[PDB]
Structure 1
Amino acid sequence: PRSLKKGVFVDDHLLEKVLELNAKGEKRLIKTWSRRSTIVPEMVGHTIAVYNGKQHVPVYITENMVGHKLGEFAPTRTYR
């Protein structure tokens, strides 16, 4: 049960950044504070540091995880 219904939303911050990194070949880590966004197929293979609020965590993005949002891979709390 999850819903965006159309125009599957992704922030304009990284979008214009990543599509330009393809035309020049895969780049190294990337800084991202917008985990609001969904994942689209053209991210597969990249590396993206998502903010948990304190640090930037490197996240290798693969084929299986195309549907979700960033931050599903950058948890916030720390327990035990």
Structure 2
Amino acid sequence: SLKKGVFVDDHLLEKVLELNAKGEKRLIKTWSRRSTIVPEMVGHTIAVYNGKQHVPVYITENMVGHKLGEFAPTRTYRGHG
């Protein structure tokens, strides 16, 4: 899915290619689950919204083509019974 273009919001895109430039920090809060994890993100802690909470995800080169939402899941399940 998604053929030619590589989709990152150009809102958190900006934020990552700044923090990397001067003295790289952490704690970037975002509500964009739609954003690809682009190799410039590799390592960081980004706070991703599942809709009631901003869930932090350490980035690793393990996961790149994915979306930032996949790692902050929307449902609290735990079981039945």
Same fold? TM cut 0.5:
yes
Question: What are the superposed Cα offsets for residues 14-61 of structure 1, whole Å, 9 maximum, x if unpaired?
Answer: 011110111112212110101111111000111100001001111000
Q: Which residue of 2 aligns with 1:71?
A: 69
- d(CA) in 2 for partners of 1:25, 1:63: 20
Distance in 2 (CA, whole Å) between partners of 1:58 and 1:34 is: 13
Count of residues in correspondence between the two structures: 78
**For the aligned residues, what is the CA RMSD?**
0.9
Alpha-carbon shift at residue 13 of structure 1 (Å)? 1.1
Secondary structure class of the residue paired with 1:26: coil
TM-score, length-scaled by structure 2:
0.90
- Aligned-pair CA distance for 1:8: 1.2
Identify which range, 50-59 or 25-34, moves more after superposition: 25-34
Q: What's the CA shift for 1:4?
A: 1.1
Question: Larger Cα Rg: Structure 1 or Structure 2?
Answer: 2
User: Which structure shows the higher helix fraction?
Assistant: 1
Q: What secondary structure is seen at the aligned counterpart in 2 of 1:17? A: helix
Q: Which sections of structure 1, spanning at least 5 residues, go unmatched?
A: none
Poorly superposed stretches of 4+, deviation over 3 Å: none
Structure 1: distance between partners of 2:55 and 2:23: 22
C-alpha distance in structure 1 between counterparts of 2:26 and 2:67, whole Å: 20
